[PDB]
Design a protein around this motif. Structure first.
Motif, PDB file in Angstrom:
ATOM      1  N   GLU A  90      -1.059  -3.915  35.170  1.00 16.99           N
ATOM      2  CA  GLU A  90       0.260  -4.302  35.668  1.00 16.99           C
ATOM      3  C   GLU A  90       1.380  -3.756  34.789  1.00 16.99           C
ATOM      4  N   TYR A  91       1.172  -3.751  33.474  1.00 20.60           N
ATOM      5  CA  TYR A  91       2.041  -2.990  32.583  1.00 20.60           C
ATOM      6  C   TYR A  91       1.976  -1.504  32.917  1.00 20.60           C
ATOM      7  N   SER A  92       0.758  -0.988  33.089  1.00 22.11           N
ATOM      8  CA  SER A  92       0.566   0.402  33.483  1.00 22.11           C
ATOM      9  C   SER A  92       1.146   0.674  34.867  1.00 22.11           C
ATOM     10  N   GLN A  93       1.099  -0.308  35.772  1.00 22.59           N
ATOM     11  CA  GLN A  93       1.761  -0.157  37.065  1.00 22.59           C
ATOM     12  C   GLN A  93       3.275  -0.136  36.923  1.00 22.59           C
ATOM     13  N   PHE A  94       3.828  -0.905  35.980  1.00 22.10           N
ATOM     14  CA  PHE A  94       5.261  -0.830  35.704  1.00 22.10           C
ATOM     15  C   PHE A  94       5.645   0.511  35.117  1.00 22.10           C
ATOM     16  N   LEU A  95       4.714   1.159  34.450  1.00 15.22           N
ATOM     17  CA  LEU A  95       4.977   2.511  34.005  1.00 15.22           C
ATOM     18  C   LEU A  95       4.648   3.549  35.069  1.00 15.22           C
ATOM     19  N   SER A  96       3.840   3.188  36.061  1.00 18.74           N
ATOM     20  CA  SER A  96       3.569   4.079  37.179  1.00 18.74           C
ATOM     21  C   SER A  96       4.713   4.069  38.176  1.00 18.74           C
ATOM     22  N   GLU A  97       5.466   2.974  38.213  1.00 19.34           N
ATOM     23  CA  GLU A  97       6.645   2.886  39.060  1.00 19.34           C
ATOM     24  C   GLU A  97       7.795   3.660  38.441  1.00 19.34           C
ATOM     25  N   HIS A  98       8.065   3.396  37.166  1.00 18.38           N
ATOM     26  CA  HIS A  98       9.251   3.881  36.480  1.00 18.38           C
ATOM     27  C   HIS A  98       8.967   5.110  35.637  1.00 18.38           C
ATOM     28  N   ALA A  99       7.962   5.902  36.027  1.00 18.09           N
ATOM     29  CA  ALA A  99       7.619   7.196  35.427  1.00 18.09           C
ATOM     30  C   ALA A  99       7.178   7.063  33.972  1.00 18.09           C
ATOM     31  N   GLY A 100       6.747   5.868  33.575  1.00 14.52           N
ATOM     32  CA  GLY A 100       6.458   5.601  32.180  1.00 14.52           C
ATOM     33  C   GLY A 100       5.108   6.146  31.774  1.00 14.52           C
ATOM     34  N   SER A 101       5.064   6.796  30.619  1.00 16.09           N
ATOM     35  CA  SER A 101       3.828   7.363  30.093  1.00 16.09           C
ATOM     36  C   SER A 101       3.532   6.677  28.768  1.00 16.09           C
ATOM     37  N   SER A 102       2.643   5.694  28.796  1.00 18.16           N
ATOM     38  CA  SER A 102       2.229   5.083  27.549  1.00 18.16           C
ATOM     39  C   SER A 102       1.072   5.869  26.961  1.00 18.16           C
ATOM     40  N   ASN A 103       0.888   5.715  25.656  1.00 15.16           N
ATOM     41  CA  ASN A 103      -0.245   6.322  24.982  1.00 15.16           C
ATOM     42  C   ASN A 103      -0.514   5.537  23.710  1.00 15.16           C
ATOM     43  N   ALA A 104      -1.760   5.611  23.257  1.00 17.52           N
ATOM     44  CA  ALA A 104      -2.211   4.856  22.104  1.00 17.52           C
ATOM     45  C   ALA A 104      -3.329   5.625  21.425  1.00 17.52           C
ATOM     46  N   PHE A 105      -3.497   5.371  20.133  1.00 23.11           N
ATOM     47  CA  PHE A 105      -4.582   5.973  19.380  1.00 23.11           C
ATOM     48  C   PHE A 105      -4.940   5.055  18.225  1.00 23.11           C
ATOM     49  N   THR A 106      -6.007   5.426  17.534  1.00 18.06           N
ATOM     50  CA  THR A 106      -6.521   4.658  16.414  1.00 18.06           C
ATOM     51  C   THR A 106      -6.740   5.621  15.259  1.00 18.06           C
ATOM     52  N   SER A 107      -6.304   5.208  14.082  1.00 17.64           N
ATOM     53  CA  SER A 107      -6.459   5.995  12.877  1.00 17.64           C
ATOM     54  C   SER A 107      -6.903   5.036  11.793  1.00 17.64           C
ATOM     55  N   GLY A 108      -7.116   5.567  10.592  1.00 13.67           N
ATOM     56  CA  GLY A 108      -7.427   4.705   9.469  1.00 13.67           C
ATOM     57  C   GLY A 108      -6.314   3.742   9.100  1.00 13.67           C
ATOM     58  N   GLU A 109      -5.068   4.100   9.379  1.00  7.48           N
ATOM     59  CA  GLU A 109      -3.964   3.239   9.002  1.00  7.48           C
ATOM     60  C   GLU A 109      -2.970   2.944  10.108  1.00  7.48           C
ATOM     61  N   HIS A 110      -3.105   3.533  11.292  1.00  8.81           N
ATOM     62  CA  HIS A 110      -2.078   3.352  12.305  1.00  8.81           C
ATOM     63  C   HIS A 110      -2.694   3.087  13.665  1.00  8.81           C
ATOM     64  N   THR A 111      -1.968   2.308  14.457  1.00 11.04           N
ATOM     65  CA  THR A 111      -2.144   2.243  15.900  1.00 11.04           C
ATOM     66  C   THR A 111      -0.756   2.260  16.514  1.00 11.04           C
ATOM     67  N   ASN A 112      -0.465   3.273  17.313  1.00  6.11           N
ATOM     68  CA  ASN A 112       0.907   3.548  17.700  1.00  6.11           C
ATOM     69  C   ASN A 112       0.999   3.669  19.211  1.00  6.11           C
ATOM     70  N   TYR A 113       2.091   3.145  19.755  1.00  2.00           N
ATOM     71  CA  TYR A 113       2.348   3.110  21.182  1.00  2.00           C
ATOM     72  C   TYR A 113       3.696   3.757  21.409  1.00  2.00           C
ATOM     73  N   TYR A 114       3.820   4.508  22.496  1.00  2.00           N
ATOM     74  CA  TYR A 114       5.102   5.068  22.894  1.00  2.00           C
ATOM     75  C   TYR A 114       5.110   5.236  24.397  1.00  2.00           C
ATOM     76  N   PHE A 115       6.250   4.955  25.006  1.00  2.00           N
ATOM     77  CA  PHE A 115       6.369   5.057  26.449  1.00  2.00           C
ATOM     78  C   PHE A 115       7.836   5.259  26.781  1.00  2.00           C
TER      79      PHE A 115
END
Lengths: 949, 939
Positions: free
Chosen positions: B80-105
């Motif tokens: 539903e969050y992803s659907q809110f980004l599918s409506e409003h052209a939003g591109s979220s992304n995430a990754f995992t590292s030794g020290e970071h987890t980062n989101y951007y949309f």
């Protein structure tokens, strides 16, 4: 004097004219010629009575008598009835006068040997020598004197006659004026006509004739015709006026003269009065000397004088003279810096005398040049039957009836005592000097009596003179080498199984291409050779084209000193630049073609440059470039004509400016790069073999790959240049203003088509039908200017029609007169009948159809196909078969779209050549001006090239 | 938790207003305010990585961030969050590292509330549901299944594991299905309850980095996030960091031989080094990265290229944790490098000893300081998405004023740190990793998780002591201060020349100079275009090779000089033409005339070496020998450009003539080549006309000074014409390939020169048959991947070309093209007005573009220079003509010109076969007798 004695005469086997010599008892030398294959039969009469055999009161009488003895017979007292009778029977008579002979010669139609010779024999019975004939003829002889006033060769000839001993009978006069021939005798009571009859009867009728008849009847029928018919001559035994001494009788030896000529020339004439060698005709040492004087070889005199730059040209040798004495003359040209050094040139003459005086006479020079004379006179080509009879009647007086042909053109024996005799003669004691130079104005007082040249002793003091006398030493001068090289083997080679009437491609490579036929028609030892050099760099720049011209210039100039003797053996050559490369033709005998040609290929294959030679050639052509800024307007028009109808053309401005940087390392470094990779095509024709030609071809290509590592070309870097298309209806023009001439020029161009079989007959037949009426209508009738031309302009395999006219006219006015003639032809299409068609197309037919008369002619024509890559060998028969196939409506169809002004396929160009300050006209379309030819030709379509036959 | 301390941040080009602030519940907030964005954006970084996982369960924080996707108490639906980004052209992304987890949309325009509602209750209620978990375990399975063969994570985990195996640096980051739900439940561990502990205590405390790229206001954004995203309340959970370097003298002076997936060859040298993050003043590790990658006089890689062992080599500082950092060296490998390894590393030591000889340097420091000043000063822009996640990465390690002014300025000089890393860069401290494919079966020590294979392989002592003891100085000397660093940054305002297109400010028969000042962009830089014409290109194939190899080795010679231009930010080009020479100069307006004049002087008076000559000669001989093995559609386009010119030297003629290349031959040719030629010039950017005249006059003066260049006659300024056809004939031939088993084909259509009619004829008819070609030919017929169509612009002459490669029957393939011809033919009149109009609008905006760089407009201006037309508003006029076409107009364009009975059918094909009308026997005898086209009148 009905006597005849003759036999078969050794007749130089090439000739077929059957001969018989005999002498008549009344002193008539008779040669009987029987040529049953000749068109014109002929006859001629020489009498040993000259213009030195004149009476002491009347000058130039024998000239007046060879005019007057034509006129008048008891059968026909009319003036030209003999002459009209030969105008019936195709006879062209003429007569002339020499110092010791007076000669008559004529011809006749085919067989008219009774008629004309009876009209000529009647001269012996009854010559008339009428009042009005004499009194107008003496005005004609006075006009002959009058026209020889400003003729410098006869003026200086009489100056030779008058500047000897004025007491010696050599000093008599030759031509005769009004006054001395007919005005002073009768005022002294001497009858001119009684002198004529006395002269004729006692002197002419007595003896010393040399008659010859070129008949075709037989030997014997004309023999007992003329020996019967010319017994009418009755002997009176005039002695032969001979001279027992030279006229240069210690007044004229070691003496100088400075002469003012009409023509602006610079010459020195040196005369040696020398004893007889008419008796010495067997060895002929004097012409052997003339062989040695003007020869160009190692250590030659002309090589040295050109090397010093003093002498433009020279000639020397035996001067023929009287019976007792002869002369020895030298005729030289002078430079400006030879003019200060003339005396030093005479010292060099004494140096060459010392050169001849050191080695003495030589045998191989004499024996081999004797053999050359032998073979070349043996293999002399032919002769015109008119002039031949006057020649052999000229020398018939001096030789027995079997010596009349090998008279002096064949040498029997070696006479080192005679060569040493004339070598001992060539001394500063024997010198007479006459300078002919125009700059002697105001300085020459002693005027000639009759003609009026002016001269002086005006000697330089004796320092130089005795400096000439004492100083007899030789310097650089060396033996000229010999180029005989088997002129014996001159026989013909019969054609092989490969029987073609045209030179076939017998050898083709990516390096070479070889066309060859051996001589079918002419049956000659000679052979002619045409040679193609392709190069990219010939047409790239003004600079590289200058480099090409200076290379070929110094190149051909270098091996010329060798080439003089070889071409003297009968082997001629040519070097010539092209936009393609250089042009080589070598034409001559089979004598030394592989050998000499090999030496040529080796020579230009590895060739070197001298520095000051390069500089003089540089300066010389540097001056030769800017010459075109003053030329003629028709010439200017032909220049722009060939300028516009090529791909690019580099101007004299650009060529002259391109010599600003040409150094010897620049050019000489460029040359092996220039010669790196080329292609050669060859045309061979004459008395040789096919396989031997293949070996000569392998020789030359091997030689080239040897010297400069010639590689074959690609046909994608073997190119030809295109020709520009027109807007298909546009007529474009521009102007050029000449500076010098007040006349304006103009030339008109038409792009018809490629040379198809139709278009050649179209353009040639149309060109000929506008050849005679236009010349009859514009220059004859309208009188536009002296330069009036019509005809074809063919380039890049594309036909054209050009008109070269320079006049003082407005060019657009003159165009209107052109268009008026175009309307005249337009109407003259339908004004042509069937007969005016057929006679004209037959005129074109005989214009086109002719076999050649030399192997060089057909070699030049076939080579003209080769340079155009066409090879359509039977274009003549094919195009004449088209020429018979034209109709009137054909030329209407040729008119409407190609020739008309409203024509939709009108490809017309003109060019104005202006002056220095510059009855029906139709509505022409407007032309454009053409300022920049590059921006003009930048976007324009181009023609194809010809698919080769 | 309304606490904020910040202001607008000193940036100048960009308008994105910035404020950083820390909330009283331990939330550091950066506000990006750009009211000029169409799409607003937002990003959150969590500085918690897999290094905070329990040692028995791998990827637990990875699985929580995976599970933090799914489920709010407001919206418990999956996407539903992803659907809110599918409506409003939003591109979220995430990754995992030794020290970071980062989101951007991002979002469509203004939609900050929606994402808040579907994101805020992640911190209140992460659901950890039945379906969320039981699908997310497959998402982790797929995540490791796509990350198993990833050589980045493979070699990086090999770096993680070949250190201390006891240290948590040796943990595994991603985690598969097996470690997520097979290992914990057999240990009886509930994953979910650990997730609840880890989110409640651990993911709630700190080290989240929030940032929003919004366009709302300074304060809308402020109480937007500060008010409702204050839901994070601090727990003071410690930072997952490492207090030591994990490469702990087990793996020093040790070699490793790695088996890669990709067939690659690399050699890796590793130094763990202490933290210099506190010292960003000198930045000694990146200063070392500056000292590694210099390629200059007396540099090491200059000799290594002179040796032929090392193609390239990158080095410098690799970041690690707060406690440790790394130093990596990555080289290229030749084969003979494998036998000369000891000497290569010896050369490394040579350069280390050169740095140890020359000591520290300040003008290098000050110089790179000036480079950071200029490059950050006039840095252009960035993608708004991803950038915010990046500076949220920089939020953890820098305060809110140092997250943007991040490292882009250099304060102080640290020679002692240079000495420190000099003590680090020692043969005692070396890790060695060899990457080679041929070490399979040879390397038994296998990586644990991914499964590549390596070997401990301690180095014998002959090589060790050769590495330690031989640290010496030879030839090398660091290059000195570059002469060109620019200070001219003052953009010149536009003067009296107010034309929008370059005017011919100077033309001679010697030179030609076109000039315009920059209207659009107003940049301190300037870009330069130059044509140098000479007729000597087509003297021989060998002279064309001379031209080529001359300019090639010429530019390659000054390339060693040009590295300072590459270091200064100044790009260039030299390139030969079949007509002449091309010169490009790009960079700042300060010092291009003087440096350019040194280029003029240098290529004017130039020397030749023998072995450089020989090498480039053989190399281009090889490339010509290799141009028998190339792409048959590219080979077909070579025949296309072959046949439709006036004359061209073939590649066989270029190939064979190279037996003749001597050094005196060309070296003699060069002053001949430099004696008479043409000069043409385009100058564009923020400069004047008068200074352009003086600079250009200086240049051509220098030319006449050195090599005495004289002009060319405009009749000797020719171009190549194009071959006339019978205008209705279709002629063809074939050529059989050697290598590729596919056949190529090209069909050619010339209408006419570029008139205003013909450009829109060509373009519009070409594009209108482009999309139905994609419909039927490429999609339906499936011939090959090389299926292309479109226009041929050459010599100022239009043309139409078709690029199809596949092994087919060639005449049947022609019949397929003929089927598409009939297709489009009937499709002209089956086209509605709508396809017509939307398509001509497609072509219109396709053609109508504003510039995007000075390069763009200079490419268009040079595009007017190459045709010499200077029809500067051809674009606007032809577009005005483009809507002036009709349906019946293009009926006439097909029928009159393009149809099978058309009198303007300019149709010709060339077949390039696989590896195994009239015929064309000889192209030479073809082109021997043929007419030629006119050229274009310049307007």
């Amino acid at each position: 004097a009905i006597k005849r004695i003759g036999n078969h005469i050794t007749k130089s086997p090439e000739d077929k004219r059957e001969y018989r010599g005999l002498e008549l008892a009344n002193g008539i030398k008779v040669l009987l010629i029987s040529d049953p294959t000749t068109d014109k039969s002929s006859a001629a009469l020489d009498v040993h009575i000259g213009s030195l055999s004149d009476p002491p009161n009347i000058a130039g009488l024998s000239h007046f008598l060879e005019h007057m003895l034509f006129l008048g017979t008891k059968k026909y007292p009319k003036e030209n009835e003999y002459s009209q009778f030969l105008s019936e029977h195709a006879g062209s008579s003429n007569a002339f006068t020499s110092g010791e002979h007076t000669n008559y010669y004529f011809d006749v139609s085919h067989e008219h040997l009774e008629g004309a010779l009876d009209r000529f024999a009647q001269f012996f019975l009854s010559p008339l020598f009428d009042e009005s004939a004499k009194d107008r003829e003496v005005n004609a002889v006075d006009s002959e004197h009058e026209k020889n006033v400003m003729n410098d060769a006869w003026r200086l000839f009489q100056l030779e006659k008058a500047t000897g001993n004025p007491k010696h009978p050599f000093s008599k006069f030759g031509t005769g004026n009004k006054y001395t021939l007919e005005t002073r005798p009768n005022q002294e009571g001497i009858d001119v006509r009684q002198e004529l009859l006395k002269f004729h009867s006692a002197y002419y009728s007595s003896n010393l004739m040399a008659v010859v008849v070129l008949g075709r009847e037989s030997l014997d029928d004309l023999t007992n015709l003329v020996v019967k018919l010319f017994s009418e001559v009755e002997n009176k035994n005039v002695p032969l006026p001979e001279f027992p001494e030279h006229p240069f009788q210690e007044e004229h030896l070691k003496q100088l003269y400075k002469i003012v000529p009409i023509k602006d020339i610079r010459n020195l004439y040196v005369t040696f009065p020398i004893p007889d060698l008419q008796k010495y005709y067997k060895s002929n040492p004097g012409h052997y000397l003339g062989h040695l004087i003007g020869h160009e070889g190692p250590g030659s005199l002309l090589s040295e004088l050109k090397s010093k730059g003093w002498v433009n040209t020279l000639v020397g040798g035996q001067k023929e003279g009287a019976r007792g004495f002869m002369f020895f003359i030298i005729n030289v040209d002078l430079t400006e810096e030879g003019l200060l050094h003339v005396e030093d040139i005479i010292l060099h003459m004494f140096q060459y005398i010392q050169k001849l005086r050191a080695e003495g006479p030589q045998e191989w020079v004499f024996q081999e040049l004797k053999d050359l004379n032998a073979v070349a006179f043996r293999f002399k080509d032919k002769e015109r039957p008119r002039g031949y009879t006057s020649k052999i009647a000229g020398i018939l007086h001096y030789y027995p009836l079997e010596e009349v042909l090998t008279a002096e053109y064949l040498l029997e024996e070696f006479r080192p005592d005679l060569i040493e005799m004339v070598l001992d003669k060539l001394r500063p004691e024997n010198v007479r000097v006459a300078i002919v130079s125009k700059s002697f104005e105001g300085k020459t007082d002693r005027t000639e009596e009759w003609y009026g040249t002016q001269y002086k002793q005006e000697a330089i003091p004796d320092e130089v003179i005795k400096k000439w006398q004492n100083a007899d030493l030789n310097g650089k001068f060396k033996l000229p080498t010999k180029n005989e090289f088997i002129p014996t083997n001159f026989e013909i080679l019969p054609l092989e199984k490969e029987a073609t009437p045209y030179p076939a491609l017998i050898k083709d490579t990516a390096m070479s291409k070889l066309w060859f036929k051996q001589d079918d028609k002419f049956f000659l030892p000679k052979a002619n050779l045409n040679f193609e050099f392709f190069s990219p760099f010939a047409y790239v720049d003004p600079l590289h084209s200058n480099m090409a011209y200076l290379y070929l210039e110094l190149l051909k100039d270098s091996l010329n000193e060798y080439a003089y003797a070889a071409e003297l053996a009968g082997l001629s050559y040519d070097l010539q630049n092209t936009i393609y490369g250089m042009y080589l033709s070598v034409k001559g005998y089979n004598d030394k073609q592989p050998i000499l040609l090999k030496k040529i290929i080796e020579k230009m294959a590895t060739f070197e440059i001298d520095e000051k030679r390069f500089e003089i050639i540089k300066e010389a052509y540097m001056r030769s470039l800017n010459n075109f800024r003053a030329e003629q307007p028709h010439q200017h028009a032909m220049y722009y004509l060939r300028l516009l109808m090529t791909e690019v053309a580099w101007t004299k401005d650009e060529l002259k400016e391109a010599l600003d940087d040409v150094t010897l390392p620049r050019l000489k470094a460029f040359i092996p790069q220039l010669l790196s990779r080329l292609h050669i095509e060859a045309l061979l024709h004459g008395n040789i073999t096919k396989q031997a030609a293949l070996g000569i071809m392998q020789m030359v290509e091997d030689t080239l790959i040897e010297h400069a590592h010639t590689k074959p070309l690609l046909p994608s870097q073997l190119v030809r240049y295109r020709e520009v298309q027109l807007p298909d209806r546009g007529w474009f023009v521009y102007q050029q203003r000449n500076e010098v001439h007040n006349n304006s020029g103009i030339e008109i161009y038409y792009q018809t088509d490629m040379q198809s079989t139709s278009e050649n007959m179209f353009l040639e037949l149309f060109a000929q039908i506008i050849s005679e009426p236009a010349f009859n209508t514009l220059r004859t009738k309208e009188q536009l200017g002296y330069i009036v031309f019509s005809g074809p302009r063919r380039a890049n395999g594309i036909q054209g029609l050009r008109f070269i006219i320079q006049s003082e006219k407005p060019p657009h006015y003159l165009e209107s007169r052109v268009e008026a003639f175009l309307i005249t032809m337009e109407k003259s299409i339908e004004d042509m009948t069937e007969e005016a068609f057929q006679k004209h197309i037959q005129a074109l037919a005989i214009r086109r159809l002719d076999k050649p008369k030399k192997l060089s002619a057909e070699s030049a024509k076939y080579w003209g196909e080769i340079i155009s890559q066409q090879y359509n060998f039977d274009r003549d028969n094919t195009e004449v078969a088209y020429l018979k196939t034209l109709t009137k409506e054909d030329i209407i169809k040729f008119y409407k779209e190609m020739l008309a002004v409203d024509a939709p396929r009108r490809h017309k160009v003109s060019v104005h050549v202006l002056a220095r300050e510059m009855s029906q006209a139709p509505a022409l379309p407007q032309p454009e001006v053409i300022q920049n030819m590059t921006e003009f030709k930048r976007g324009l379509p181009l023609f194809p090239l010809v698919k080769p036959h």
